[model samples]
Target: HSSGLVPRGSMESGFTSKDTYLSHFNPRDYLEKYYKFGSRHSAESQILKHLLKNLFKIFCLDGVKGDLLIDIGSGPTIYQLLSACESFKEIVVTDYSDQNLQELEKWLKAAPAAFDWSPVVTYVCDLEGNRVKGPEKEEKLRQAVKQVLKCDVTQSQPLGAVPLPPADCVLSTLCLDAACPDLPTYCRALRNLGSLLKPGGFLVIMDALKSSYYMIGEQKFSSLPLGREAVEAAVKEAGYTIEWFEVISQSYSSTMANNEGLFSLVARKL
Candidate 1:
């Protein structure tokens, strides 16, 4: 699993941002801090909603009456997937971080039963993680989500290995640019996500294109700055067409100290 590759070295090391590895990010922690930042204070939610609405118009998440949606790089909460519930009967959120899924379970416990949520499953495993972490990560996933599959977006064959049932829609948020390792890596990730969907499947993505640094608690990490044109071009190369996308403004009081701008895109398989 060791790629023997060195760190990018492009992002500065040891930069701590308020949002990174947030002290209260632990799934077992009962502190309200995660909600504090995720709710009213985090404007990314609103931006996400706007993107979903535009995407819905194009892909018709509700209109298609799709059965499943696979959320790639799902974080500690279901904020992104919840928006698509109206259209998909099942939602699966996958990420490389167990801490994120642990917190997601805690969030589910606290969610309002009246929220009209659909059946959901959250798993932790990625193409790179499966190669690096192997069965150890698979064991953790056994307890977290209904099913865990190794899917790597960087390579085509690696993605085809995921054994889950076919999906109608796919999604990712603030993920590809940071964890993808590089531009080609990002392209591979998109191609992999697209593979999960049936032909004419839908995709919704929201990420930071130009911004480099973000705080997720006490830790700060660098993101691969991607432009709208670049992402669109990459998706096009990956066999998708953009239906709606924008370089929008996102407000984050914790990291940006008030409000910041980000980029987002929504597209579908051709």
Candidate 2:
């Protein structure tokens, strides 16, 4: 866990031994199993339901044309994007960990149809652009990735600011909490994202703000809440006007051990 990749761990290049330890479950095995185990009791299901509702609220499900969106921490995201394919021409997914990305690759290859890039451009980027994960994982992911950028968002140069080409939309569901140190950290992260979006672009975020923990198998993670007010402030400070804000009650109940509820938002840049 001494590697910088683990967040709060020592700075080192390459996957940490701890990641290797966490790799006990094969990427495919873990994803498939989680689909079954985590699907029912997990908060992700609830978040997806929330996501769909928000997508409709913003007209994202049937929104516009030729816009590109980046799902900052996309994991096993094909189906989600496919559902909203009408809204974007490209979708980029980034993650600090590649375990899930690797799993996504294998699934996409066996059934390329699972990913319809016609209206979307898909890519997988690692914590830092070194392709730091693993070859076995990267290759599988490449089939689904168009670009792999290295970045560290915690610092001023996080993700290295890569010129942040104008994008029409950007989103992350249940992503910022683990990366942001606290409420303030979450706002900073959103501010950084705001800088990346084009004027008049949209940002929609949905996550379990109160969920203290989540699991990828036996391993667990901690998440923090940036409820409606904090989220609205974050958007406004970033220069976006709140077009719609909703604190929804999910039709489905969260089975996540943390028992967190939903926090979703739709904001537009002025």
Candidate 3:
């Protein structure tokens, strides 16, 4: 068995395969089958629980605050913003797929049959303390989100001519690894997004650890199989100071996919 961690492309531009891959992106299949919060008593559910708890602690418990927090590659998921809304006045969520963005807009507009994330919100509030006002917390997240725009990390300016101010904090979850075919492209993508942060601003990331691919319906998408050391080096080389780093081995394994662990890190612009 291999970690599938080897570099696959020669140069940064050579890994520009995300355009065609993401063109077939299906948000409905992804949310229905794979998103952890959609299920109970499963490995993915467990992963989501731990990820959210750590996210809350880092951004909420540590008292990180900002006026604008940008979420890069937001794939119709709002659970990541549960703690963020409490700290950031405005949140901008971006993705490459229009279908995924529409799925996100459905939830933000309270459309019928929208994916239910109340379980995640409940868990986050319990982590915050014992005030079980889940609806209030969910509403707060809805209000905090200011926009859901298109983004392409490979572009010189991912957000593109959208005339925006630099973010106080940028949150990218499972984005770079899945989008970049290799390490150089991953580092380049990181640098592109990192440029969005203000001087001394924070960059928060939650990504797969040591996995090459994941399945959505019958489609398989490639991941970069990044480990903690690689991530640390990438951040440092991108001119960011690591404020914190943590990786948790998966409690359960899946025949559907292979990943050594899940990782989260917070870095500050230097």
Candidate 4:
């Protein structure tokens, strides 16, 4: 799977970075520390709910229904698909890490120690104007999601050249920037992932604004550090029309540095 490309001199170089990302990225610890969807007091969770509500509102107003929705680089998370599951008949999630895929599978199968998503369901139900349909929403999402597969953003074919059928829509949240080391890599990664979408399909993306690093336990992982303009330019260059975009400003916290804001956009393949 090696691309045989040399690392750039300006980029961070260390076996420590590689080992930290490849070995210490425990799905359970990641979820417990950064993805507590059930906690209303959690700032990240609240921001995600706000972002999802905006995206779903646009979906409802625009009547964006489809047969298939693919979530790329879904890292032990499902809240982003709550409203989208209703609009698509089948949902497929992919991630680079097997442990992350296993965590997603655990939730899909209702296994023990799965992260609780009751708060997310309830929040999405309220957005749909059917506040009492939380359980129904959860079941719909679980049923709609049929597969979880491996993916690699740096490759020309992220899911391999299996000639897989295109999807009607794709959702990628905070994965591209976190995975790519620079803007050029980010745009290439975006274009590679965009090839999975059918013509006229929508692409929903959420990413951190100008973020450089994030922490899990004692390890700090790097981000590409992109701003809103860069994201829009990359999406356009990737053959998408920006229908809606918003940047939710966030105050810098003591725990996480370089996280200036959160941005979500709804774009269409043209």
- The total of clashing pairs for model 4 equals 0
Instruction: Report the lDDT tens digits of candidate 2 across residue range 1-270.
Output: 432223222134211223442344244543443333333345444454445445544543335334567667665554344333444555566554565565555445655433233211221112123343343333343443444444333555445655556778877766665566466666677777776688888787776645554445444444564566766787688678876666765532333335345676777778
Candidate that beats the other on lDDT, 1 or 3, i.e. the better one: 3
RMSD list, candidates in order = 10.9, 9.7, 4.0, 4.6
- Which pairs of residues collide in candidate 2? 2-10, 41-255, 89-120, 90-121, 128-150, 129-150, 151-159, 152-158, 152-159
**Candidate 1 segments whose C-alpha is farther than 4 A from its true place:** 1-64, 108-162, 251-260
Tens digits of lDDT, candidate 4, 45-78: 6666677776687556567778988888898888
RMSD from true fold, candidate 2: 9.7
lDDT for each residue of candidate 3 in 13-102, tens digit (9 for 90 to 100): 433246544565678777766564655778878887887887888788885788999999898888888888889999999988788889
Off by over 4 Å in 2: 1-34, 37-47, 56-65, 111-145, 148-152, 155-158, 161-164, 251-255
Candidate order (lDDT): 3, 4, 1, 2
Give the winner by lDDT: 3
Question: Which candidate leads in TM-score?
Answer: 3
Inter-residue clash pairs, candidate 4: none
Worst 10 residues of 2 by lDDT: 119-128
**What clash pairs does model 3 have?**
none
lDDT at position 89, candidate 2: 55
